[PDB]
A paper describes a structure:
The most well-studied baculovirus is Autographa californica multiple nucleopolyhedrovirus (AcMNPV). Baculoviruses have their large circular dsDNA genome packaged into an enveloped rod-shaped nucleocapsid. The BV nucleocapsid structure consists of three parts, a central helical sheath containing the viral genome, an apical cap and a basal structure attached to both extremities of the helical sheath. Herein, we report high-resolution cryo-electron microscopy (cryo-EM) structures of the BV nucleocapsid combined with de novo modeling and Alphafold predictions.
The inner part of the basal structure has a C7 symmetry and functions as a plug closing the void created by the peripheric C14 anchor complex. The C7 ring, like the anchor-2 complex, is also composed of the two proteins Ac101 and Ac144. However, a major difference in the C7 plug involves one of the Ac144 (Ac144_1) monomers, where a kink is introduced between residues S38 and L39 in the long α-helix (residues 28–60). This kink results in a large re-orientation of the lower Ac101/Ac144 module (Ac101_2/Ac144_2) leading to the formation of a closed plug structure instead of an open ring as in the anchor-2 C14 ring. While the inter-subunit interactions involving the dimeric domains of Ac101 (residues 122 to 219) and residues 160-170 of Ac144_1 remain similar to the anchor-2 configuration, the globular cores of the lower Ac101/Ac144 module now face each other directly. This organization is stabilized by the C-terminus of the upper Ac144_1 (residues 270-290). In contrast to the basal or apical anchor-2 complexes, where this region of Ac144 is disordered, it is ordered in the C7 plug allowing it to interact with the lower Ac101/ac144 module of neighboring units. These observations at the C7 plug for Ac101/Ac144 proteins further expand the conformational space this modular assembly can adopt.
Numbering used by the authors:
A (entry chain D): 208 to 334
B (entry chain A): 7 to 156, 161 to 171, 198 to 290
C (entry chain C): 113 to 196, 200 to 234, 238 to 264, 269 to 334
D (entry chain B): 38 to 152, 195 to 271
E (entry chain B): 38 to 145
F (entry chain B): 219 to 271
G (entry chain A): 219 to 290
H (entry chain C): 208 to 234, 238 to 258
């Protein structure tokens, strides 16, 4: 037991002077391009190491609002606002953010998959 | 190359169209490559070494600073480094301040603890102070040249598929370049905002963010010390001696 | 019987760190201190150094009196141990470091400290600024100055080829730690308070500079 | 007047989402919350309730929802999924949410093209940001519903191949998926 | 009658601010509170609720606000910002308020 | 004070600090999209100019 | 060995050496083609598990958040 | 293998349920799978 105690003691670190520690400024990717699948695997492994946070809602009921006056009032305020421009702006900012993330991540962008994302239009229209 | 996007709503045949130019995304991708930034920094260092070489300054920097008798080489080295940094900031002026004097310090009794290269006005001409023993102690310190700082798969796949510049010399070059970069930031505040602001900055480096970002952050290139985020090990514990129940309303430096 | 070679290597590494002559950051344990002290005792020509560092056990017992020949011999002994310049202030740094290491209690996590208690006149940065500025203005300038930036593509290519295998991050780490240690040693030697707020604010300035 | 009826559909849905966000007891506008990395609880609440609203729209018979949600707010690039700012899944029956805060901030902070007495008014940027967040959480909910209906493997394969949005979305539940505002528009990418 | 409509706008806004200050349960008129350096809680409450009222006016969809606020009531000149009697910011998500009491007293 | 605070939230503590010394961010960083929003402020109902004499 | 070789021949040396250190890529690089065209694999005849696997694995435990659990 | 197994069996305390372990502490160079992959791959490429 004395030998085990001395073994624990001799492995105790001693005082050391401070050192300048280098941290990666930007998560710079490597030369070789990566596909979406390998990127997903790597980023999921990275996310696994994070510490999740618990969220507790006040109740189970779905949030909603049945106040008529407020609803028609919001509708009137957004009435002069074309749906074409709104949807175009939303879709284009989504696309730009996706492409920017793909470019920064050195990941290949599959145009066909992004086009297939929004084919529910014709799926609804035909059926 | 350009990429076009079309949005169509189910109330009509109207289609709103936007054109994206791929060059922006390519530039972001290139700026995201580790090899690209590594190449930029190494190319700056290589240009510095070439500039020293064409000035006969081929001898190792430690040997240059170890020669007490020959002051001309030390003065030329420091002046050339200052001029190189100035050109990096302003890529239009190839010649530094046309007239300036150098004084070499060999004593602790007249040494500044932490600013080896200092600048002053003798009412007639710029004067630059060089703390020779400090630079010698910097360059002569043994370097950690076997430890690894954090791709094995590409190496595995590959396995299945003349001036002698050592690492110590390159580290010495980078050390001197960073030191003269700090000195040049102090000198820039000096020249552009007066002796009073220069001596205010000597005791408080936090004014750099306000006196550089106004002009340098949008006109010049990136600074060498900005390549990595440097922090002091266990900084909070050591700083615990000086803790304030603070209320920061002008936190101009995060 | 003890292994002279292993103890000598441990002593060499621990003294390299404790003299601030190297930036090699290796986690040092109590075993390394035991080995360095035992080797210092056993080796005949390191007896002066062993006694010097052993006197640090009690804060009230200060450095033994050594005549100039003894100090020179101890300096040669330290130089031989480090096979590297080294002078009296290095010995002072080593004495302070070993004193603080010895008086420290046994603990599970490495204690991070800064250099202190080396070299009467407890000053600050501004008084030193004024005094050394006057002293520098006293000194006569040596050289009066009254620029090729060649972009020879082949030459820069060869330089990049030579520099390419070097791990840039390691070079930056070495340079930054060297500057930090030189600044800290100059502060401690000059008996001036080292304000790590300012030094860390330097890095914070760089970080804030980049993102704009 | 059918196109007017469909516009009324879409705008009433957007207004109901607006009113739900109002009832959720917000201190700041959406973008403002998303730039506030210090308060992750509010961001998690907004994302969770948008998911709940979409869930009720897709399943009109469902009136409540789970009261717990494990969430991580992504800050760094090396833990962010491109093209999927918000991702929903569950493990051992516990809802799992991942939010890429910088991506959503960039989404809502873009410059959008812009070709009574109480002082109440809603700007175009605010409404378009609302629609954008609804669409993003709606894409996340499509992935989540693919998960529940066809396994974590179909979820993972759909994360890389989005044709499951048109294969696994059978025409029987076409009326159900038509309740989503993501189905009211088409976005195509053509080389030029 | 457009100028009358705009004056009605402004005066109704001022009256709503008046009524909010009334509901906030005040013991003294504004100036009187601001000369009372002994009671910093009331001054902080007035400044905070005026901030909240402005926040609601600027963001009509926002109906609530944070319930905590770190505040310092400036008394001396060497801790006062000229031209900025009240300053708001937050650090680690906690609202931070600074009030220059003598300046506001001189203003009112 | 709320204008400075909103500049803080919308563009960083640095834009807040720079606006504390340079008030032209009140006219640069206040984009016309939220002009209806800023018109809700009573500070926007008047102009105060200083002219040397 | 043949599963490793199949990934090699069909997806490159890089993917082969990636698979040598992480067998979990088999599920993605086999089920795309083999799960619907070939027969059943010999090692799939029985479900193999390591005795007291959780206890031995307790040395490597993560406060995880798995959003791409492509291998149950 | 026998020495390591018996050492671990002997130093183990008396306990009611069998302890499940893996082989360890047999045969300086503490490596991982990838470095071995590279090294033995080069060595195999050497072999005719």
């Amino acid at each position: 037991i004395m030998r085990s105690s001395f073994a624990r003691c001799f492995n105790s670190p001693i005082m050391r002077y401070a050192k300048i520690v280098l941290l990666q400024n930007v998560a710079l990717q490597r030369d070789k391009r990566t596909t979406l699948e390998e990127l997903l695997i790597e980023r999921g492994e990275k996310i696994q190491m994070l510490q999740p946070q618990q969220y507790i809602n006040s109740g189970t009921e779905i949030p909603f609002c049945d106040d008529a006056e407020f609803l028609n009032r919001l509708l009137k305020h957004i009435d002069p606002y074309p749906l074409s421009r709104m949807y175009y702006n939303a879709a284009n900012t989504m696309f730009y953010t996706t492409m920017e993330n793909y470019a920064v991540s050195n990941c290949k962008f599959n145009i066909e998959d992004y086009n297939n994302i929004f084919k529910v239009m014709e799926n609804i229209r035909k059926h | 190359n350009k990429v076009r996007t079309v949005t169509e709503i189910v109330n009509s045949d109207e289609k709103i169209q936007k054109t994206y130019e791929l060059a922006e995304f390519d530039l972001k991708n290139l700026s995201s490559l580790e090899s690209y930034e590594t190449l930029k920094i190494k190319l700056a260092l290589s240009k510095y070494m070439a500039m020293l070489s064409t000035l006969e300054m081929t001898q190792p920097l430690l040997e240059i600073f170890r020669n007490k008798a020959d002051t001309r080489q030390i003065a030329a080295v420091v002046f050339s480094t200052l001029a190189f940094i100035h050109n990096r900031f302003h890529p239009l002026v190839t010649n530094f301040t046309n007239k300036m004097e150098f004084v070499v310090t060999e004593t602790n009794d007249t040494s500044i603890p932490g600013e080896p290269i200092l600048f002053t006005e003798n009412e007639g001409v710029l004067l630059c102070s060089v703390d020779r023993p400090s630079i010698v102690k910097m360059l002569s310190r043994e370097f950690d040249t076997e430890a690894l700082v954090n791709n094995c798969n590409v190496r595995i796949a590959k396995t299945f598929g003349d001036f002698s510049i050592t690492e110590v010399e390159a580290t010495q070059y980078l050390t001197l370049l960073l030191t003269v970069e700090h000195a040049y930031l102090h000198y820039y505040i000096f020249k552009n905002y007066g002796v009073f602001e220069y001596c205010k900055s000597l005791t408080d480096h936090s004014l750099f963010t306000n006196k550089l970002r106004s002009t340098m952050s949008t006109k010049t290139s990136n600074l060498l010390l900005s390549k990595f985020k440097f922090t002091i090990e266990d900084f909070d514990k050591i700083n615990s001696n000086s803790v304030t129940s603070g209320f920061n309303i002008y936190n101009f430096n995060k | 019987l003890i292994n002279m070679r292993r103890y000598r290597n441990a002593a060499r590494k621990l003294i390299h760190h404790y003299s601030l002559n190297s930036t090699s950051s290796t986690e040092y344990k109590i075993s390394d201190v035991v080995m360095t002290m035992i080797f210092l005792l056993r080796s005949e020509k390191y007896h002066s150094l062993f006694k010097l560092l052993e006197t640090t056990f009690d804060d009230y017992t200060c450095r033994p009196q050594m005549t100039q020949v003894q100090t020179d011999t101890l300096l040669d002994a330290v130089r031989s141990l480090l096979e590297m310049t080294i002078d009296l202030t290095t010995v002072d740094i080593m004495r302070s470091s070993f004193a603080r290491c010895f008086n420290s209690p046994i603990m599970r996590y490495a204690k991070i400290v800064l250099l202190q208690n080396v070299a009467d006149k407890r000053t600050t940065l501004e008084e030193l600024l004024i005094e050394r500025g006057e002293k520098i203005q006293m000194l006569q300038p040596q050289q009066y100055i009254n620029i090729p930036f060649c972009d020879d593509a082949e030459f820069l290519n060869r330089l990049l080829k030579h520099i390419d295998p070097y791990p840039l991050s390691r070079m930056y780490y070495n340079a930054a730690n060297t500057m930090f240690y030189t600044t800290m040693e100059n502060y401690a030697v000059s008996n001036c308070k080292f304000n790590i707020e300012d030094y860390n604010n330097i890095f914070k300035v760089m970080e804030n500079i980049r993102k704009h």
